[PDB]
């Protein structure tokens, strides 16, 4: 037999529902998430990291001018300066006074803590999610792990258990996030090799192994001081460790519904909100036929005690002749209150919980396949602060029959009433004005 | 709260206005032809404030 349901995407719920065969005894399941994940698609699109300068060993050679050449590397610069005169350690160097003449040259590359350390850039695109559902009925306690786009099916002992699609499946992510060891950001970087010099992205890369660079922090070569021996140098400073100290915050403070971040791959777990749904391919060999059903007849329920309030703060007894021992199954058939146990015992009286978040609710409830109604008048708690959420559907809306709202049809009657004198009165003499 | 709570009170108080509204007009239409003749011969119908 074949069934169809929706639960509530929210970690530590109860939910329930049934089957009615037809001559069998009827069965209760429920259903309880414990986990959700949530996972959307990459690709790199670049890297960049820390960089480091060379200045390899100046020439001079002297009464002898110059010329230097080029060489593939990115940002190589050459100069060259006429009228040197050095001094070095031991005595002046040499002495061809005049025409003397020096070259110099620098360039960049990267670091050596780059393979240890990087800041990656990406793209986000559709996603999907998966979840772990405590499913439990009958003799058995099971969970199941499951994708949730509608084509994964699991096989407990007989049945089939397909998900439905989603109800939307927007995310916390835009397409453009920037992945740093540990936490993600929302930046907006520049496309590739337009990088002005001293904000983030003045070096970037693609697969992170060799060979291609781009690199513009405008290198210029200075002239030398008055006799001595130095390569003089200027930069506007890095890009990199300028961005990692005056940053913003990040990604995991900010999170719309408690969505919480942890990534070796990218994720973003127990975000709660919405619904999904289930259907249902459900075995024979878990129901009973009639044999060990017993017949339960004049069942009347009353109440003693209700709070609101955030758990299992309704009690209430219930009153049956009994013919043959056994186990029932019990439900109440409607969206204000929801009970606790999920199988009563057999002969006598015995009591079952709920919760309600309304002031007088009024509810239908059947242990086995008789039904019988009873309700009550509520009161609020004295508390403000609880460290334990929502057992509740969280419908706080008024009865059809109140001591709130018996108030009310007194007083709409009553002013429905008074002019219903007044309508006719005008009629009685309206007809004998036409003498 | 508001939104209920005002709402009430103003389908009431018309309904209010309305029976005055077409109660007196009886009363005229009732007392009216007796104002006009020259002859002050009111019979006892004292239930609707006779002059």
């Avoid at chain 1, 009925?137 to 998900?163: C, P, R, S, W």
């Avoid at chain 1, 029959?401 to 009629?427: E, F, K, Y």
Wanted: glycine content about 6%; overall charge neutral.
């Amino acid at each position: 037999y074949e069934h169809t349901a929706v639960i509530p995407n929210q970690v530590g719920f109860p939910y329930k529902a049934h089957v009615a065969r037809e001559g069998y005894s009827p069965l209760t399941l429920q259903m309880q998430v414990v986990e959700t994940s949530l996972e959307p698609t990459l690709n790199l699109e670049y890297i960049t990291c820390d960089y480091k300068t060379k200045v390899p060993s100046p020439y001079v050679k002297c009464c002898g001018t110059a010329e230097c050449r080029t060489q593939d590397k990115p940002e190589y610069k050459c100069a060259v300066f006429t009228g040197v005169y050095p001094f070095m350690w031991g005595g002046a160097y040499c002495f061809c006074d005049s025409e003397n003449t020096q070259m110099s040259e620098a360039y960049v590359e990267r670091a050596d803590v780059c393979k240890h350390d990087y800041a990656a850039a990406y793209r986000a695109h559709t996603a999907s999610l998966r979840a772990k559902i405590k499913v439990t009925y009958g003799t058995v306690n099971q969970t199941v792990e499951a994708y949730v786009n509608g084509d994964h099916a699991v096989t407990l002992a007989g049945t089939k258990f397909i998900f439905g699609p989603v109800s939307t499946a927007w995310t916390p992510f835009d397409t453009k996030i920037v992945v740093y060891k540990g936490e993600v950001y929302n930046q907006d970087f520049p496309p590739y090799g337009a990088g002005q010099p001293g904000r983030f992205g003045d070096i970037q890369s693609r697969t992170l192994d060799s060979k291609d660079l781009y690199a513009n922090t405008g290198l210029k070569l200075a002239r030398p001081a008055a006799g001595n021996i130095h390569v003089p140098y200027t930069q506007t400073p890095s890009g990199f460790k300028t961005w990692q100290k005056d940053r913003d915050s990040p990604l995991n403070a900010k999170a719309p519904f408690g969505c919480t971040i942890q990534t070796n791959p990218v994720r973003a777990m127990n975000c709660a909100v919405g619904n999904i749904p289930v259907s249902m391919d459900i075995a024979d060999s878990a129901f009973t036929r009639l044999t060990d059903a017993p017949i339960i007849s004049e069942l009347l329920c009353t109440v003693s005690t209700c709070t609101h309030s955030s758990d299992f703060g309704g009690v209430a007894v219930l009153s049956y002749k009994v013919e043959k021992a056994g186990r029932c199954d019990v439900h109440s058939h409607s969206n204000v209150a929801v009970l606790q146990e999920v199988s009563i015992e057999a002969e006598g009286r015995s009591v079952i919980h709920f919760s309600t978040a309304s002031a007088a609710p009024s509810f239908i409830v059947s242990v086995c396949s008789s039904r019988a109604t009873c309700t009550a008048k509520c009161e609020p708690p004295k508390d403000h602060v609880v460290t334990y959420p929502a057992n509740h559907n969280g419908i706080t809306l008024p009865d059809l029959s109140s001591t709130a709202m018996t108030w009310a049809q007194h007083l709409a009657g009553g002013v429905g009433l008074l002019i219903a004198l007044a309508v006719l009165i005008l009629v009685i003499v309206t007809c004998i004005t036409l003498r | 709260t508001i939104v209920v709570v005002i709402r009430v009170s103003v389908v009431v108080l018309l309904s209010f206005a309305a029976s005055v509204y077409m109660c007196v007009v009886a009363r005229t239409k009732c007392l009216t032809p007796y104002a006009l003749t020259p002859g002050a011969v009111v019979p006892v119908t004292i239930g609707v404030l006779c002059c």
